[PDB]
């Protein structure tokens, strides 16, 4: 109603921008171990105009991919609305959910892999001890 809009100072809390999504992803994936020194810098793949380095690293590439995923969800909703409809709004809450899922899944799978590798090393040491026993 126009009466509500008057007597109230209006503030357009617009949707999160590309740079906002990039910053959210970067500060929410800082704890995650994503540093790959052997990253090969590709061509193209532009999503965030202000990529922090001109040649991106692995972590910046991952965050750019995350914001690209959010943008592709927005574009998929737009296309679905274009050809027919029946869509559900994508919101920054979805982005936070996706980032939290990424963090939890990455940590869980990396922990499982590290546990299996440590078990393999323990088995190697025990079997070397058995080798010494057999030689004796």
């Amino acid at each position: 109603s126009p009466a509500l809009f008057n007597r109230c100072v209006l503030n357009w809390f617009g949707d999160w921008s590309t740079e906002a999504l990039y910053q959210v992803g970067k500060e929410f994936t800082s704890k995650m171990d994503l540093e790959k020194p052997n990253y090969i810098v590709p061509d193209y793949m532009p999503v965030v105009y202000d990529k922090l380095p001109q040649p991106p690293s692995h972590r910046e590439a991952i965050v750019n991919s995350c914001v690209f995923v959010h943008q592709t969800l927005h574009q998929a909703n737009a296309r679905l609305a274009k050809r027919g409809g029946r869509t559900m709004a994508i919101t920054p809450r979805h982005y936070l959910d996706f980032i939290n899922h990424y963090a939890n899944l990455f940590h869980e799978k990396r922990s499982e892999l590290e546990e299996q590798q440590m078990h393999l090393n323990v088995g190697l040491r025990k079997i070397k001890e058995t080798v010494d026993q057999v030689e004796e």
Binding site: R86, M88, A89, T91, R93, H94, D97, Q116, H119, L120, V122, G123, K126, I127, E129, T130, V131, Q133, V134
Partner: protein
């Protein structure tokens, strides 16, 4: 507040506010919101707080279901290879890890005694074999994937036909209120054609089994749907199945323009310049000729009818659809189905009263002759009450107002020497 997962954690205890009330947020609490209506537009406030888990069956979902079912049935080796490929990611690795853990716990239990060697050795060698198998599986991944791709491409048209058939059958409710069909009905049809196929008792060649499965699927779906479907609508369902098969068949044109003109394009603005043509043609026949000649294959329709001398005789024939003169102009010879489509357009133009009859002809030229022959025969439904009907599924006998269907069931019960407790439902008792 619950969806937002707000927590007023204070005093070493977890808290949450529900209205004016304050309540402890007990751990291991999950809430699963649910709905039954596929088409609901939730507000963004609710949309942001939930993960939408959609179980609605769609074209792609049913296509994948049918593909998996036919791959498991027809080609158990390809299905086994697919299962092996899926397992190779984590399940085979888990099995190998557990085998190695068993080796470790046996070796530390036996202390690696040289007398115990043999009990170790077999295990060790077996473990090697296991890894060797895994190694072989990781050395032949691409070949198995390309084989599975070839088989899936071979079986894809059947899955597309199955999905299209089910969705035509489901949409059949628009024609009449009594044509409500469920997904379980089509799944039963698919399982009956896939497993209980009398035409597949000895067929071994995979392509032959696939062709037999497709043909019997079309036939069985049509028979089961039309057994409980009005006689004036059998031709509609047969034409729809013919269209589905035509979209599925290869080596044929899509006939999109001809079909669109047949269904909807016949009603277009072409009344201007409706010449009387010949004495045989009437005003509506002239208009139909004008509309049909808009198509590229019939652009010379005017001269083609005017030059012909026996065309006027054909117009007054008892069954024009039997002998339809070759009138369309085509640069290259067409398949019999294209001939049927063009003659069907001609019959829609000239003598529309035979259209239905010619429609049947078209079906016999597309889905094969005697496709409707089962419908003409009397209802041998003793087989339909023996098998094809589960006890949980009732048998509804809907009769045209003024007809009685209790006679058929009473005679079959007498034949099958099974008692029936016939009850009239008019009274309250």
């Amino acid at each position: 507040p619950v969806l937002n997962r707000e927590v007023r954690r204070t005093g070493g205890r977890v808290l949450i506010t529900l209205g004016d009330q304050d309540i402890d947020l007990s751990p291991s609490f999950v809430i699963f919101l649910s709905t039954r209506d596929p088409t609901v537009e939730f507000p963004p406030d609710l949309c942001s707080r939930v993960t939408f888990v959609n179980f609605t069956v769609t074209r792609s979902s049913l296509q994948s279901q049918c593909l998996n079912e036919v791959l498991k049935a027809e080609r158990p080796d390809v299905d086994e290879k697919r299962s092996d490929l899926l397992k190779l990611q984590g399940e085979f690795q888990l099995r190998l890890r557990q085998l190695e853990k068993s080796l470790l716990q046996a070796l530390n239990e036996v202390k690696g005694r040289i007398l115990d060697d043999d009990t170790i050795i077999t295990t060790l060698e077996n473990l090697k074999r296991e890894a060797a198998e895994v190694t072989r599986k990781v050395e032949e991944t691409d070949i198995v994937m390309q084989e599975v791709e070839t088989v899936s491409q071979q079986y894809l048209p059947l899955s597309t036909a199955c999905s299209s058939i089910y969705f035509t059958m489901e949409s059949l409710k628009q024609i009449h209120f009594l044509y409500q069909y469920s997904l379980q009905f089509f799944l039963d049809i698919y399982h009956n054609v896939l497993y209980e196929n009398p035409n597949l008792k000895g067929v071994t060649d995979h392509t032959q089994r696939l062709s037999i499965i497709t043909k019997d699927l079309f036939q069985v779906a049509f028979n089961r749907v039309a057994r409980g479907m009005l006689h004036q609508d059998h031709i509609t369902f047969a034409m729809l199945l013919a269209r589905i098969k035509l979209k599925g068949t290869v080596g044929e044109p899509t006939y999109d323009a001809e079909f669109q003109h047949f269904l909807r394009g016949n009603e277009i603005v072409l009344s201007a310049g409706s010449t009387p043509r010949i004495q045989g043609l009437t005003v509506e026949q002239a208009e139909a000729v004008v509309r049909l000649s808009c198509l590229p294959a019939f652009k010379d329709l005017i001269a083609k009818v005017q030059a012909d001398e026996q065309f006027g005789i054909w117009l007054d024939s008892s069954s024009p659809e039997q002998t339809v003169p070759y009138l369309w102009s085509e640069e290259t010879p067409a398949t019999p189905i294209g001939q049927a489509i063009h003659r069907l357009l001609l019959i829609q133009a000239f003598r529309p009263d035979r259209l239905l009859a010619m429609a049947h002809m078209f079906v016999s030229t597309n889905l094969g002759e005697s496709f409707m022959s089962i419908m003409e025969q009397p209802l041998d439904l003793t087989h339909i009450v023996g098998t094809e009907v589960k006890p949980n599924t009732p048998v509804l006998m809907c009769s045209v107002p003024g007809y009685d269907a209790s006679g058929h069931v009473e005679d079959l019960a007498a034949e099958q020497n099974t008692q029936i407790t016939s009850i009239a439902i008019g009274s309250a008792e």
